[PDB]
Homo-oligomer: A and B are copies of this chain.
Amino acid sequence: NTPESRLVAAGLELPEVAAALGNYEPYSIVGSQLMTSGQFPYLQGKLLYQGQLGADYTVSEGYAACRLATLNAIAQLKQACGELSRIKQIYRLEGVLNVHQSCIEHPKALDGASDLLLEIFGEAGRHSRMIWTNPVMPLNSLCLVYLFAEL
């Protein structure tokens, strides 16, 4: 029973992996640690969420956005390791959101990422996390997600 089967059972198709925005690699590996560059909420090559939590998007939409960015991040991890069953653990999630001052519910939005990790990787998806808000995002994305995996 693989992460891939769970994606199928959840009705989730892994997107095509997006190109870097600059002269960097989409992931790197040091020893047993695999880490992604920033992953966006793309669907069918379109950046679906462009704006700010609390102003343009509700918390439930932010949740959806972090879920989709994480699906993109998982696509990136699959590209890197072939079979997602090779991943011993997704030990760390780090996420950035653009958030209006009137809203401090961004940890709920980032649960979109956390929840998918647990859904797809099970106990292997239990992770620590970091959260940031930034005023300006690449592509005006609502969010950016980074994953760290142990092989």
B107 touches A22 (CB 8 A): yes
Q: What does DSSP make chain A's interface, helix, strand, loop or mixed?
A: mixed
Q: By the criterion of a CB under 8 Å from any partner CB, how many residues of chain A are at the interface? A: 54
0 or 1 for each of A115-135: is its CB under 8 Å from B? (1 = yes): 100100000001111111111
A22 to chain B, nearest CB (A): 4
Most buried by B among A111, A115, A126, A131: A131
A134 neighbours in B (Cβ, 8 Å): 132-135
Where the two chains meet, the residues of A that have a C-beta atom closer than 8 Å to any C-beta of B are 21-33, 35-38, 89, 91-94, 96, 99-101, 103-104, 106-108, 110-111, 114-115, 118, 126-140, 146, 148, 150
